[PDB]
Amino acid sequence: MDLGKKLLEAARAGQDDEVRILMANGADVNAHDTFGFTPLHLAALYGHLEIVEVLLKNGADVNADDSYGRTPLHLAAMRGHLEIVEVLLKYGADVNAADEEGRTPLHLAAKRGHLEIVEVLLKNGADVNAQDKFGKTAFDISIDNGNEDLAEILQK
Template sequence: MVGVAMSARRLVRALAPFMCLASLSAAGPDQRVPEAVKKRDATAVRELLKQHADVNGRQPDGATALHWASHWDDLEMTRLLLREGADVNAANDFGVTPLSLACTNGNPSIVEALLSAHADPNAAMGTGETP
């Protein structure tokens, strides 16, 4: 019985590093950039992007930094995120795209920036609505 207990302890010790790595990879998406844009912290956004944070990181509802830039009518942030490779057609869990938000807000400058970056004007939300 002592031999079995020793073997089990050795097995746990051997597997512990792999279990730690697995838990790190399951930590979830990088939400730092969308959170910074949500808080309207342009300095933090720029610093995070310099550190190669994920410009397309998603919040639990699927919102991205570009969704928040559109929501806040922030043309400068929208342009920065597009230059950094933001997915112009990202849809949140409700099917809402940054273009949908810009149209809802009635901001022609952001609509133009998104369309110039190839936003799909025919992307439909779950309800069938299009921008």
């Protein structure tokens, strides 16, 4: 029986019942598809807070990363799922985690214009000045985008 697939699907679809049940029958919270997405990645990416919590409380790896190096935190930042970003941190997510390009969650949020998430990442010890492997930082991204509100946050 392959309850790993049945759990991933349930995590993506926001079916908190199916998730509870599936784990009760020993489905592995660190299942992963052929590209390294855990149920936590999917729940985070799709905005499913109750599921993100129940996965973490059941020992899901919070700093798992897909085959391009992205943590669940990266993905939560990508989408602008603020309350999720916070609980990922509260349970030990690495703020300065870097994907295969060297991007941290700060880069990704900055790049999408998710300013509330930028503010919160910084407050949990994000490194304003970290460079990705091409040299770029949050401030490069603000100027590259003409984003005035972001460049402001990154000083005063």
